[PDB]
Design a protein around this ligand. Structure first.
Ligand SMILES: *[C@@H]1O[C@H](CO)[C@@H](O[C@@H]2O[C@H](CO)[C@@H](O[C@@H]3O[C@H](CO[C@H]4O[C@H](CO[C@H]5O[C@H](CO)[C@@H](O)[C@H](O)[C@@H]5O)[C@@H](O)[C@H](O)[C@@H]4O)[C@@H](O)[C@H](O[C@H]4O[C@H](CO)[C@@H](O)[C@H](O)[C@@H]4O)[C@@H]3O)[C@H](O)[C@H]2NC(C)=O)[C@H](O)[C@H]1NC(C)=O
Ligand SMILES: *[C@@H]1O[C@H](CO)[C@@H](O[C@@H]2O[C@H](CO)[C@@H](O[C@@H]3O[C@H](CO[C@H]4O[C@H](CO)[C@@H](O)[C@H](O)[C@@H]4O)[C@@H](O)[C@H](O[C@H]4O[C@H](CO)[C@@H](O)[C@H](O)[C@@H]4O)[C@@H]3O)[C@H](O)[C@H]2NC(C)=O)[C@H](O)[C@H]1NC(C)=O
Ligand SMILES: *[C@@H]1O[C@H](CO)[C@@H](O)[C@H](O)[C@H]1NC(C)=O
Ligand SMILES: *[C@@H]1O[C@H](CO)[C@@H](O)[C@H](O)[C@H]1NC(C)=O
Ligand SMILES: *[C@@H]1O[C@H](CO)[C@@H](O)[C@H](O)[C@H]1NC(C)=O
Ligand SMILES: *[C@@H]1O[C@H](CO)[C@@H](O)[C@H](O)[C@H]1NC(C)=O
Ligand SMILES: *[C@@H]1O[C@H](CO)[C@@H](O)[C@H](O)[C@H]1NC(C)=O
Ligand SMILES: *[C@@H]1O[C@H](CO)[C@@H](O)[C@H](O)[C@H]1NC(C)=O
Lengths: 51, 213, 220, 236, 220, 213, 213, 213, 220
C-alpha cells in the first residue's frame, strides 16, 4: 500500500513504480508499474484522507 | 492566495451523530469564519472569530483551531443542519473562502418506486422523443439506471437529474431522460428503464411497448 | 434590522456594461465595508473585492481587478459593482455582504447575471399519468419543461389550489446550452378521470407564462 | 517536445582542440555526461555514456561530439528542425546514448556547434568492477562481480572451522582459506549444485576472529577472480 | 477609485489621421503623468510617450516622433493621442496609463486602431458533424468564418447559451490579405438530430450579422 | 536609452514548482517593475519598486535584484499564475518594457481527439474547398498534422491555428485547414488528416470520401 | 536540512486558561512530534505523529497541523504542565529539534521580601568583600536591583542570579551580589540595596552600616 | 575579470534576527557560491550553485539571485552563524572571491572593566617602559582610550589590540600599550588611561603614580 | 572519505624555495581540479591558480604566474605548489581545495608560510596584579611578550593547568618591525598570595621557550 503526498505535484502524477528485492540465498528482484487511469484533480481524496 | 482546504468535501451523518469537519489554511491566519448555505439562498454567518456562534446558531455547533488548522463540530447532527459549510479568512489580501463541505443527512435504506413516461405526441410532432424514468423517494443517492430499447442497451443518450433531500423523510428522487430523434423512437418497440439500487434485492425494470395505444 | 437588498436578474449582451446595486438599511452606512462575492454553477464562493463606503478604499481579488469596479453612493446607502465588458465566464450569482472585521455578518439575496444575446422560453410537454406511473394507489404525472434559457423557471400546479406530493427535478444543462427540467406531482390514482391538472410554467427572463393540461394516457 | 537529432559518425579534427593545457572555467556546464547501464535485466549489459548538452546564439544545424579514451571517435548530430530557443520550461536539452565505457579509463569529451578548451566539455574517469554500474560489465561479471556468496564461518572445535557459502553458476571450484597472523587452514572445494553449501576447513591455530577468504576459480578469470571475505565467529 | 476610460475602436483610412481619448476620474488629473503604450500583434509593449497634464509638457519615444501627438483637456480630465497618418504598421492596441514614479499603476482598457483600405464581411460555412461516428462517443461540429477584413469577428453559439465545449480559434491572416477562423464545439453524437446548433457570427466593421444552422450532412 | 532583456521568452512550469524569470538591463537602473497580462486584457501592475507586491498579488510572488540584474519568483506554481510577465524601467528615457516571459502551466499528457470536416456544398458553389481537421483538448502543445489527398502528401496549402491554454483543463485545441480549388477538390476521393502527438503511441488518421455522408 | 521554529520561546499561563504554541518547519514534513521536559530529567514523548497522545498524557493536550505549520494546544492550563516543550521532525536527515517553548505558571503579583547581608569576617580575611541582597518569593520575574555605597550608585561590580519558579507557590527569588576589595569596603559605612518591583508602590531600600552588628 | 563586491563588509545581528548580505558581480555569471569561514580554520562550502545548501547547512540559510545580483539570507540568526562569508565565481577565468561579509553577534551593551599596569622593573632595566591599559569584557567594539602623562594628553605613542568576540558572552577585550623611553618614564609621575564607551555614562579613568604600591 | 592533507608550517628565508603539498585521498585523483588559495592577515581569499591532475594543465591568477608553480604527482595523488623565490609578501596561509564545476567542495587544512630573513626571540615581562588592576574581587595579571620576529608566539598559563578568564591579544606590529603581544588572565584577588601564576611563552622560530612567574608588586 502507498499513500500519496498531498501537494500540487500530484496534479502531474501518472504512475507509481514498485520494486521488491528478496534477500534469500539467491536474491529475487522484480518491479511493477501501476498507471493511474485519470489525472488527480484534488490533492487529497474528497471523502477525507490522503489518496 | 491563502488556500483553505476543507475536508471532507462531502459527508453524511445520521441524526444524533457527532460531526467534525476541518479547514486547513495553506499559511497561518488569525481567525477562521464559517458560513452555512442551504440550496437556493444566500450563505449565512454561522461561526465567526473561530469559535463564536452567530445569532440563531444552536450550541451543538462549535469551532476550534489556530494557526493553519481549524475545525467545526456538531455535537448531535440534526436534519436542519444539512447544508454546505464554507470557511473563510481575511488575515491577508485577498480575502478567500474554503472549497466547502457538503453535509447530508444519513437514513435507513429506502428502495425507489420506478415510473416510466413515454414521449408525448405533442413532442413527437416537433421531431424528438424524450422518455422519462422516475426513481422516487430512495436512499442512498447511488443508483444505476440503464435504458434498453428493444433489449438493446443504450449509452450516451440520457441525462439524470436528482432532487434535494426531502425535508420530511430525507430521501432522493431521480429522473433519467432518454432523448431520441422522432425517427429512431418510432423505429423501436420496447423501451425499458432498469434500476439497480441497494434497497432492491434484484434490479427492477419498468417498460412500455411503443405503439400500444 | 440590517438589510442588504440587491437589484434583480439581468440579461446582458456580451461586450456591454452592467452595474448591479446593493441597497443597505438598518445601520450607519459609513460604518461597514461592503464585499462582493461570485457563485457560479460550480457552487464555490469567489471573493471579488471590498469597498469602504466612508473613504472609497478598495481591494480586489486580482482575478477581478480590471474587470469589476466597485463604487458607493452615500445618499442612498447603496453600493455598486460594474462589469465593463461582460463575458460568458461572468454568468453567475453575485452577492454583496457587509463586514466590520474579517467576517461578513449580513448578505444580500444575490443577483443572477446572464451574459448572452437572447432568452428563450420553454416548450412544455406532458408526462401523462398511466398505470406505468402508478404505485400503491398514487399516480405520478408532470410537466417536462424543456429548452429554455437562462434559468430559472417556476412551476405551480392548478394555480396553487393543488395539495399533492411534489418532486421538482433541478434543471439540467443540455448540450445545446438550453436547460430542461421536470416538475412532477403525485395524486390519488382514482382522481385521474375526474380531476384536471394544469402545470403553470413561468419563465421570467423571457416573460413567458404557459398553462399546460396534463391528461391521463388512455392506455392503462 | 523539441527539434529532433539524427546522429551518425564523422571524422574528427584530431585530439588537440579538446585537451588543451589550460583550465576551462568550471561553471561552463552546457555539456553533461553520466555512465549508464543500457540493459535493464541483471545479466551482462553494455555500459554506455549518456551525453547531454544545453542550447546565446539563436539557431543551429548540427552539434559535434568527440570522445577520447585514454581511443578517438566523433559523432555529428544533425537537427531535423530548428525554431527561430527554449519552448518547454526547461532549457533546450538533447542527449545522445553511445560510446561504450571501458574499465578504469579517463574520458575526454568535447563538443562544438555547427555552424560555430571548448565551452562544452566534460571529463570523468571510469571506475572498476566494484562500481555499482561497471560491475555489470561482461568482464566484471565473469570475474564474479555479481556473486553474493553470503559467507558464514563458524568455529566448531579448536582445529575446525565451518564455512557456509552460496555457489555461483559461473564455476564449480573454490578455495576457502583461514588467516590470522598466518594461514592456519585451507580447503579446495568442488560443488556442482547451485545451493548454500557447507565446508569444514582443518585449522592449525586459533581460528576465532580470523579472516576467511573464498577464492573462486571461474574458468574466465584464471587467478584474477574477485575474492570474497568474511570472518570466523562463534556458533549459536 | 481611479479609472481610465478609453474611446472605442477605430477604422481609419490608410494615411488618414485619427484621435483617441482617455477619460480619467477618481483623482486629481493635473497631478499624474499620462503615458501611452502600443501593443502590436507580436504582443511586445512599446512606450509612445507621456504628457504632464499640469502644463501639457510631453516626452516622446523617438522611435515614434512626428507620428503621434499627445494633448490633454484639463477641464474634462481627458488625455488625447493623435496619429497624423495611420499606416498598416500602426494597427495595434493602444493603452493609456497613469504613472506614479517610474511605474504605471492604472491602465485604460485599450483602444484598437486598424488601418483598413476597405471592409469585407465574412462568409460563414457549416462544419458538419460526421455520420461515421462512434456509438455514443463525442461528435464535433462548427462554423468556418472565411475571408473577412479587418479583425475582429465575434462568434457565439445558440445566442450565447452554448459556451461549454466551444473553441473559437484565433484568426489567421490568409495570403489573400483576408482573415479566416473556425469556431467548433464538441457534443454527444446522440445529440445530432435532437438539438439545434446555430452559430451567430458578427463582423462590426462591415455591419455583417450571419446566423448559420449546422446540421449533419444530408445522406441523400 | 536603456533596454531590458527577459529570459526565458516562454516556459511552462509544473504545478507546485518554483519559478524564476529574469530581466537584464543594458546598464544600471534604480528599480524594475513587473506587469502581468492575461490574454485579451490590459497589463496590471504586479511587482513594483523591484520587490513590493501590488495589493491582492499572492505572496508566493517575490521580486529582487539590483544594478543590471533582476528576477521575479514564484515559490510554488499555481494555474492562476499562467500569464505573460513584462518587466519595465523608467530610469532613463525612453520608458521601456522587456519583451515578456510567457508562463504556461504543465499538466498530464493528453492525446487529441481528431475530427475531419468536408467542405460544405455552399462553399463549393463559390469555387473553393476548405477541409478542416480538428485536434481537440490535447497537451502538450506540440503536434504534427499531415494532410493526404488520395495518399498524396500535401504541402504549402494548409494553415494551422492554436488556441490558448484552457483556463479549466489547461489543454490546447488546434485546427488545420487545407484549402483547395473546387477544381482540384472534385478530382480526388480520399481526404485524410494524420496526427502525430506525444499522447498517441501511433499516428491517428481521420478520413472521409468525397460526397459520401 | 529542515529547521523548526518554535513560538513563543517563553510564555506564562494561569491555571485554567487556554495555551497554544506553534512549530514552523522551513519546509514540508510528514509529521511533527512533541516532547515535554522538566528541569533535571529526560524529555518525554508527549504528542507524536502530529496529533496522537502518548499513553497517560492528559487529554487537555492536543496537536494539529500539516505541511510546515503545527501547534500544540492545552485546553486548560494546569500547574503540572509548566515545562519546556520541544517539537521534532525526522522527515529528512538530519533529525532536528525545535528551540523549545518554555511554559511557566502565571500567578497573582507578589512583592519581594528584601534582605541584605554584610560580608562575613571569614571572607574579609581573604581581602574580598561580597555584599548580598536577596529578593525572596516575588512574582513576576522582572525586578531591578541597584546598589548604593554611601549613597553613591554602583555599576559593573554586581551579578544577579534568579531561581526557577518555586514548585509550591510559583514565585521567583533573586540574589544580587556586590563584590568589593576589603580596602574599598572598609572605606565606606552605608551599604544599601534598592529594589524595584511591580508589587511595590515605591522602591524598597534595605541597608546596613559597616561593623554595626 | 569578475569582481565580487560584498555588502555589508561587517555587520552584527542579535540571535534570532533576519540577516541579508549581498554579492554583486561586475559582469554576469552563471552561478555564485558561498563559503563560511570562522577565524583560524578552513572555509567550508556553504551555499553553492546560487541557492543549494551544502551538506550540513541548516535551512535557515538561503541563497538567491541571478545575473550580477545575488544575496545570502539567514531567516533567524543563531550564535554559531558568527563568521566571515565569501562569495565566489568561476564562470570566467580567473576564479575570483568576494571581499567578504564579517557577521558578528549583537548583544546588550556592556561597559568595560578598566585595569592599568606600570612597566615592570625588568623592562626598565632594559631601557624601555611599556604602560598597559586593559578594557575587559565590553560590548560594542567601539571604545576610545586616551593616555595622559602628568595630565598631558598623549598621541602617536600607543597601539591597541582587540580580541575576537568571546565564545560565552560575545564581549570584546582591548589592550592599549603606551611606550616611552626609560628616560621619559622616570621623568613623569601620573600615568592615566581614560576610557570612553557607550556603557559608561561618563569617561572612566584608571591611573597610577610611578613608584606606588 | 574525501580528505586533502597539507604539509606542515614552514619558516623559510626570503629568496629560497619552498614547495608545499596537498595529499588527497578518498576519490579518483584525476577527476577533479585542484585549486590553491592565499589568505593574508587581511583575511581576504586570493585565488592563485588551479591544475588538472590528468595532464598538468594550469591557469593562474596573473598576480601569481611565474611566482608560484603548480604541479601534480599522479602516483601519490598529490598536488604541489612551489614558490621558487620567496619574498616577505608571501607570508600567509595557503589552502589547497578540490573543485568539481565552479565551486570548491573540499578544502585542505591550510599551510602557514612565514618569510623571515632572521629571527629574534622575545623578552617576556610581567604585568603584575595590583589594586589598579583589581575590580569586583577579580585581579588581572599577564605577560608582555615584546620585540620578537617573525610570528607566531604561543602563550599558555601554568602549563595548561589554569582555569580562568583568559585574554591573549593579537600581536601588534611595532614601528621597528618587531612584534609584541600581551596575554592576560583574570583570577580571584583572594588567590594572589597562595596561588602562583606562570606564563609559558614559546617562540618556535627562534627556539625560545620562556616561563615567567607573575607576582604582585610589594614595596621594599
Ligand atoms: C490491501 O491493503 C489495503 C490497505 O489496508 C486495503 O485497502 C482498503 O481497501 C478497502 C476496499 O476498497 C477499502 O474499503 C472500501 O473503501 C471504499 C472507499 O470509501 C471511501 O470513500 C467513501 C465515499 O466514496 C465511496 O462512494 C463513492 C460513491 O458513493 C465512490 O466514488 C467511492 O468508490 C467510494 O466507494 C467514504 O464514505 C468512505 O468513508 C471512504 O473514505 C468504500 O466505499 C467501500 O465501501 C463499499 O464496500 C463496503 C464493503 O467493503 C460496503 O459496506 C459499502 O456499502 C460500499 O459498497 C469500502 O469501505 C479501505 O478503505 C482500504 N483501506 C485503506 C487504509 O486504504 C486493501 O483492501 C487490501 N487488499 C486486500 C485484497 O486485502
Ligand atoms: C488601558 O488598557 C490597558 C489594557 O489594554 C490597561 O492595562 C491593564 O491595567 C490593569 C490595571 O489597570 C492591569 O490589571 C492588573 O493585572 C496584573 C497582572 O499583570 C499580568 O497579567 C495581565 C493580564 O491580566 C497582563 O496584561 C500584564 O501585563 C501581566 O502579564 C494584576 O496583578 C494587577 O493587580 C496588581 O495591581 C494592583 C495595583 O494596581 C495591586 O493592588 C495588586 O495587588 C496587583 O499588584 C491588575 O489586576 C492589566 O494587567 C493591564 N493590562 C495590560 C495589557 O497592560 C490600562 O490600565 C488601561 N489604562 C487606563 C488608564 O486605565
Ligand atoms: C471604522 O472602522 C471599521 C472597521 O474597519 C470600518 O468598517 C468603518 O467603515 C470605519 N468607519 C469610518 C467612519 O471610517
Ligand atoms: C548530417 O548532415 C551532413 C551534411 O548535411 C551529412 O553529410 C551527414 O550524413 C548527416 N548525418 C546524418 C546522421 O544524417
Ligand atoms: C577536461 O580536461 C581538459 C584537459 O586537461 C581541461 O582543459 C578541462 O578543464 C577539463 N574539463 C573540465 C570541465 O574541467
Ligand atoms: C540522460 O541525462 C538526462 C539529464 O539528466 C536525463 O534527463 C535523461 O533522462 C537521461 N537519459 C537516459 C536514457 O538515461
Ligand atoms: C546469509 O545466510 C544466512 C544463513 O542462511 C541467512 O540467515 C542470512 O539472511 C543470509 N544473508 C544474506 C544477506 O543473504
Ligand atoms: C552452515 O550450514 C549448516 C547446515 O545447514 C548449519 O547447520 C550451520 O548452522 C550453518 N552455519 C553457519 C555459520 O552458517
Amino acid at each position: 500500500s502507498w499513500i500519496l503526498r498531498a501537494d500540487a505535484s500530484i496534479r502531474l502524477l501518472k504512475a507509481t513504480k514498485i520494486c521488491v528485492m528478496g534477500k534469500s540465498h539467491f536474491q529475487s528482484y522484480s518491479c511493477i508499474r501501476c498507471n493511474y487511469t485519470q489525472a488527480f484533480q484534488t490533492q487529497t481524496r474528497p471523502s477525507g484522507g490522503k489518496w | 492566495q491563502i488556500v483553505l482546504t476543507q475536508s471532507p468535501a462531502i459527508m453524511s451523518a445520521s441524526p444524533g451523530e457527532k460531526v467534525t469537519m476541518t479547514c486547513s489554511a495553506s499559511s497561518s491566519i488569525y481567525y477562521i469564519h464559517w458560513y452555512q448555505q442551504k440550496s437556493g439562498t444566500s450563505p449565512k454567518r454561522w461561526i465567526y472569530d473561530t469559535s463564536k456562534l452567530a445569532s440563531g446558531v444552536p450550541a451543538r455547533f462549535s469551532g476550534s483551531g489556530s494557526g493553519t488548522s481549524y475545525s467545526l463540530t456538531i455535537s448531535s447532527m440534526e436534519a436542519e443542519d444539512a447544508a454546505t459549510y464554507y470557511c473563510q479568512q481575511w488575515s491577508s489580501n485577498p480575502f478567500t473562502f474554503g472549497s466547502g463541505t457538503k453535509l447530508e443527512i444519513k437514513r435507513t435504506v429506502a428502495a425507489p418506486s420506478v415510473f416510466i413516461f413515454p414521449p408525448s405526441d405533442e413532442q413527437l410532432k416537433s421531431g424528438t422523443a424524450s422518455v422519462v424514468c422516475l426513481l422516487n423517494n430512495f436512499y442512498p443517492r447511488e443508483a444505476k439506471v440503464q435504458w434498453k430499447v428493444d433489449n438493446a442497451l443504450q449509452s450516451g443518450n440520457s441525462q439524470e437529474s436528482v432532487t434535494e433531500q426531502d425535508s420530511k423523510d430525507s430521501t432522493y428522487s431521480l429522473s433519467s431522460t432518454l432523448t431520441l430523434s422522432k425517427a429512431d423512437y418510432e423505429k423501436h418497440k420496447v423501451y425499458a428503464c432498469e434500476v439497480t439500487h441497494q434497497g432492491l434485492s434484484s434490479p427492477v425494470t419498468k417498460s412500455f411497448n411503443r405503439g400500444e395505444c | 434590522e440590517v438589510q442588504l437588498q440587491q437589484s434583480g436578474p439581468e440579461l446582458v449582451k456580451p461586450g456591454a456594461s452592467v452595474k448591479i446595486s446593493c441597497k443597505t438599511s438598518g445601520y450607519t452606512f459609513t460604518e461597514y465595508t461592503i464585499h462582493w462575492v461570485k457563485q457560479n454553477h460550480g457552487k464555490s464562493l469567489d471573493w471579488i473585492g471590498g469597498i469602504n463606503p466612508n473613504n472609497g478604499g478598495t481591494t480586489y481579488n486580482q482575478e477581478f481587478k480590471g474587470k469589476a469596479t466597485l463604487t458607493v453612493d452615500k445618499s442612498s446607502s447603496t453600493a455598486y459593482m460594474e462589469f465593463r465588458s461582460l463575458t460568458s465566464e461572468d454568468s453567475a450569482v453575485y452577492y454583496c455582504a457587509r463586514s466590520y472585521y474579517g467576517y461578513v455578518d449580513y448578505w444580500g439575496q444575490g443577483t443572477t447575471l446572464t451574459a448572452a444575446a437572447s432568452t428563450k422560453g420553454p416548450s412544455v410537454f406532458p408526462l401523462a399519468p398511466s398505470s406505468k406511473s402508478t404505485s400503491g394507489g398514487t399516480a405520478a404525472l408532470g410537466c417536462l419543461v424543456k429548452d429554455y434559457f437562462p434559468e430559472p423557471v417556476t412551476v405551480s400546479w392548478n394555480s396553487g389550489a393543488l395539495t399533492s406530493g411534489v418532486h421538482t427535478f433541478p434543471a439540467v444543462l443540455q448540450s445545446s446550452g438550453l436547460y430542461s427540467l421536470s416538475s412532477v406531482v403525485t395524486v390519488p390514482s382514482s382522481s385521474l378521470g375526474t380531476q384536471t391538472y394544469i402545470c403553470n410554467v413561468n419563465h421570467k427572463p423571457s416573460n413567458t407564462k404557459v398553462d399546460k393540461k396534463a391528461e391521463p394516457k388512455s392506455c392503462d | 517536445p523539441e527539434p529532433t537529432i539524427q546522429c551518425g559518425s564523422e571524422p574528427g579534427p584530431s585530439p588537440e582542440w579538446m585537451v588543451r593545457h589550460t583550465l576551462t572555467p568550471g561553471d561552463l556546464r552546457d555539456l553533461r555526461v553520466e555512465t549508464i547501464k543500457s540493459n535493464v535485466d541483471l545479466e551482462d549489459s553494455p555500459i554506455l555514456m549518456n551525453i547531454s548538452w544545453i542550447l546565446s546564439i539563436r539557431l543551429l544545424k548540427a552539434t559535434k561530439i568527440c570522445v577520447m579514451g585514454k581511443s578517438y571517435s566523433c559523432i555529428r548530430c544533425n537537427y531535423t528542425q530548428a525554431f527561430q530557443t527554449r519552448p518547454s520550461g526547461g532549457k533546450w536539452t538533447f542527449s545522445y546514448v553511445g560510446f561504450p565505457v571501458e574499465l578504469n579509463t579517463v574520458y575526454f569529451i568535447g563538443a562544438h556547434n555547427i555552424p560555430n578548451g571548448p565551452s562544452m566539455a566534460v571529463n570523468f574517469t571510469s571506475p572498476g568492477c566494484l562500481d555499482h554500474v561497471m560491475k555489470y560489465k561482461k568482464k566484471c561479471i565473469e570475474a564474479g562481480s555479481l556473486w553474493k556468496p553470503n559467507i558464514t564461518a563458524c568455529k566448531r572445535s579448536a582445529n575446525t572451522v565451518e564455512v557456509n557459502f552460496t555457489t555461483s553458476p559461473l564455476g564449480d571450484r573454490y578455495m576457502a582459506l583461514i588467516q590470522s597472523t598466518a594461514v592456519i587452514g585451507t580447503s579446495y572445494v568442488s560443488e556442482k549444485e547451485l545451493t548454500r553449501t557447507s565446508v569444514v576447513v582443518h585449522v592449525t591455530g586459533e581460528s576465532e576472529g580470523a579472516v576467511v577468504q573464498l577464492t573462486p576459480y571461474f574458468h574466465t578469470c584464471g587467478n584474477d577472480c574477485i575474492r570474497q571475505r568474511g570472518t570466523v565467529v562463534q556458533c549459536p
